[PDB]
Amino acid sequence: ADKELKFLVVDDFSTMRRIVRNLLKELGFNNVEEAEDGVDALNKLQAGGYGFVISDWNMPNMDGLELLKTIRADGAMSALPVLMVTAEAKKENIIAAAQAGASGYVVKPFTAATLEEKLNKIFEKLGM
Amino acid sequence: MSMDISDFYQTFFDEADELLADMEQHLLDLVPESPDAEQLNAIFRAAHSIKGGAGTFGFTILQETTHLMENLLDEARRGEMQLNTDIINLFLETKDIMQEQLDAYKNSEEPDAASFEYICNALRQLALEAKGETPSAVTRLSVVAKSEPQDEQSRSQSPRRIILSRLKAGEVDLLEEELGHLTTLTDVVKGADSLSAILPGDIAEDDITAVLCFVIEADQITFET
């Protein structure tokens, strides 16, 4: 529940990144960064500082899961929380996310009120 | 207050117009026989972005139209599909139609049904043609329906009960809500703090374990009777 948590809003789409941003806003979150892909993100992540990957499932060069497995077979990034943002609540996504090691999932578009609740539980389970 | 979408639309409409203009220019600059990888990636990303926005706001016709184009652009960018002038012209026509669909939504109007059917039909025809007539040799020639029709119908009686012990305030409702995403719960005993329900067996024990594990832990989970 850090209203400053560094959200790597990994998504290749700007307006969404913007309302996500504005809702984070009406809810009080204002610290949001944008990335456009997995190599970019992996490159970006090969850097560091990222705490929450609000990663859209899909991107070019390397997607959400390769991102996630490479993330996982690699010594250094093996345990980052990745909130897979998904357009819809689906099981295999939910499970593959689970077997390759993902942290949680959410469905857009949400009201300020909903985004509000999901964040709460991951925070909960990871101990945040 | 009240997340109204009839203004989160304006930002989308503007982004979409811009992405449609970019799509058009990239398409016009593409060299079919040797498409610049970076240019195709941009066309694909514009389409992916427009599709997600269309899904978020329930713009059915635009979403499906963009969906079909995106899959095609993915094939071409991965190098699985060859491009030519006809295909590029179809993409341009697709961009033209998507713009008309967007312009209808801007006016709180419904897009053109006939143009929608025509473009989707053409896009699906191309994908089909991009296939060389089904896969090589017969596939799924057996792996399909395996084990014949089970004896009773769905497990004789070994659903295994899942016992979720130790849940929180609103978690009863919520986990009820979450297990409700993976599987279906019956005999929902909503105790003050518990949730028991019988379990179907539709997911490897090893995997149910894995997802509940997004909200709860491996030992909170017992499989027995």
Looking at the structure, do residues B80 and B163 belong to the same domain, yes or no? no
* Amino acid at site A91: K
Q: Across the interface, do B53 and A113 touch by the CB < 8 Å criterion? A: no
Same domain assignment for residues B133 and B117? yes
- A7-10 and A52-56 as β-strands: parallel, antiparallel, unpaired? parallel
C-alpha distance from A63 to closest chain B C-alpha (Å): 13
Question: How many domains does the structure of chain A reveal?
Answer: 1
Q: β-pairing, B161-164 with A32-35? A: unpaired
Q: CATH code at B170?
A: 3.30.70.400
Counted domains in chain B: 2
Strand order in the sheet with B186-190: B186-190, B195-198, B161-164, B221-223
Q: Are A115 and A27 in contact (CB under 8 A)?
A: yes
Indicate the pairing of strand A32-35 with strand A7-10: parallel
Given B145, B178, B205, the domain boundary residue is B145
Q: Which two tokens stand for residue B58?
A: 């329930």
CB proximity B37 to A under 8 Å: no
| C-alpha to C-alpha distance for A37 and A59, rounded to whole angstroms | 5
Q: Print the domain residue range for B151.
A: 146-225
For residues B116 and B176, state if they share a domain: no
Q: B106 and B10 in one domain?
A: yes
Rounded to the nearest 10 degrees, what angle do helices B171-182 and B205-212 cross at? 140
B103 and B55 within one domain: yes
Residues B72 and B110 in one domain: yes
To the nearest whole Å, the CA of B58 is away from the closest chain A CA by 10
Give the C-alpha separation, A126 to B177, whole Å: 20
The answer to whether the annotation marks A58 as part of a ligand binding site is yes
Query: Which of B100, B118, B145 lies at the terminal end of a domain, its last residue?
Result: B145
DSSP notation for B43-100: HHHHHHHHHHHHHHTT-HHHHHHHHHHHHHHHHHHTTSS---HHHHHHHHHHHHHHHH
Length in residues, chain A = 128
Gap sites in chain A (C to N > 2.5 Å), preceding residue numbers: none
CA distance B78 to chain A (A): 10
φ, ψ at B196 (rounded to 5°) = -125, 155
- Between chains, do A109 and B210 touch, taking CB under 8 Å as contact? no
DSSP state of B197: E
Are A94 and B182 in contact, with CB atoms under 8 Å apart?
Answer: yes
B224 to B158, B178, B204, B221: CA distances (angstroms): 9, 21, 14, 10
Residue A125: give the domain boundaries. Answer: 1-128
Residues B140 and B84 in one domain: yes
Beta bridge partners of B164: B195, B221
A83, A120, A76, A88: which is closest to A9 by C-alpha? A83
By the 10 Å C-beta count (0-12 exposed, 13-18 middle, 19+ buried), B40 is classed as buried
CATH no. for residue A36? 3.40.50.2300
B6 contact A CB<8A:
no
Candidates A103, A124, A111; CA nearest to B211 is A103
Boundary (domain end) residue, out of B127, B145, B163: B145
Q: Given CB atoms, is A113 within the 8 Å cutoff of chain B?
A: yes
Q: Which two tokens stand for residue B16?
A: 């979409």
Q: Does A93 touch chain B (CB under 8 A)?
A: no
- Which residues in A lie closer than 8 A to residue B76 (C-beta atoms)? none
> Which of A89, A113, A125 faces B215 most closely, judged by CB atoms?
A125
B74 touches chain A (CB under 8 A): no
- For residues B125 and B154, membership in a common domain is answered with no
Query: Are residue B11 and residue B110 in the same domain, yes or no?
Result: yes
Report the amino acid identity of residue B45: R
Q: Compute CA distances B209 → A128, B83, B99, B136, whole Å.
A: 22, 46, 46, 38
Task: Using an 8 Å CB-CB cutoff, list chain A residues near B12.
Answer: 15
Cis peptide before B200 (omega within 30 of 0): no
